Each structure stands twice: as C-alpha cells, then as structure tokens.
C-alpha cells in the first residue's frame, strides 16, 4: 500500500485498501473508514464494482435524467466518490469549513454553503435525489464568485468548480458533448 492519504498527501494514521494499494486518513475517506471489515474495499475499489457488474452503467446519460435519481445505496457511493474527489485537490481547503463575510463592497450569500456540511448532510443521508447534493455543491462556487466580485482570489471557485464537473460527468457518465 501507499505510505500517504490519498486525499491529502500526508502520512499519519493510515488504513490500507485490501483491494487496491491506497491508503487512507479515518476522516480522509468517505464515508470514514468502517470501524471492522476484514477485507476492506475503499470507495474507488466499490465504484469500480459497480461499473464492472453492470459495464451498460458506462454509456451515456443525461444530467437532467441523473438529477431526478432517488438517493439509493448506489447514488448516495456515487455522491460521496464526487465530494471525494473534490476534498482530493489541495484548493478545497478554502470551500471545506464554514465561511464569513466582511469585505468592503460585498454582501454575504444568501444560503452559505461548504464542503463539510455537504459532508455532514450525505452522513445523515439527508438528501433524496442527486439533485439535493449537486444543487448544494454548485452553490458553494456560486457564493464564492459573486462575493469576490472582480478580485482575482474569484478564480479559485472556478478551479475547484471544474474539478467537482469533470469528475460529475465522469462518475455519473454524463454523454460526452461538444
Ligand atoms: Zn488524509
Ligand atoms: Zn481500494
Ligand atoms: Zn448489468
């Protein structure tokens, strides 16, 4: 196995995948890491599961389609593979705990949002559709570019904006497109 969290890039407390060389933080993982489980298969090694018992899984969906999903056992890995990978870039780090505002010329949204309470939200399986957690994943970006208005640190939402969409389209194969 590897000799650092998959996730964020450090040593520590690691639990190894029997299936897979990665290893991970407790809290790292998601959902974190089952307390028993001997073997014990990390999130990447069950998405890869589903894909192979069901290969048909893979060709193209619509995302209006993949919205209106209820939340079942399949959807709720899938969700939590997504949040996943986006805790995976180093830049989460400024959407993961709760945020404030007090700068000059903007005003706070609405409905804050952040990746530890998504996090919090899958756990206590308070979501019904996909629609719920994709909604509130979006609305972390959508917060971040209109507070920062026109100063550059704006970008850092778009970044980590694209990652949470490629990886949308990728887990949930989303039909390629022009
Ligand atoms: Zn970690
Ligand atoms: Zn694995
Ligand atoms: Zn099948």
Redesign the pocket.
Known sequence: NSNICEVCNKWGRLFCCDTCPRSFHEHCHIPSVEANKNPWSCIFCRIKTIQE?????QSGHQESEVLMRQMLPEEQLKCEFLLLKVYCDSKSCFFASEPYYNREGSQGPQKPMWLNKVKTSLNEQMYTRVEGFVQDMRLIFHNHKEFYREDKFTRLGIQVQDIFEKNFRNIFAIQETS
């Open positions: 018992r069901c290969p048909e899984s």
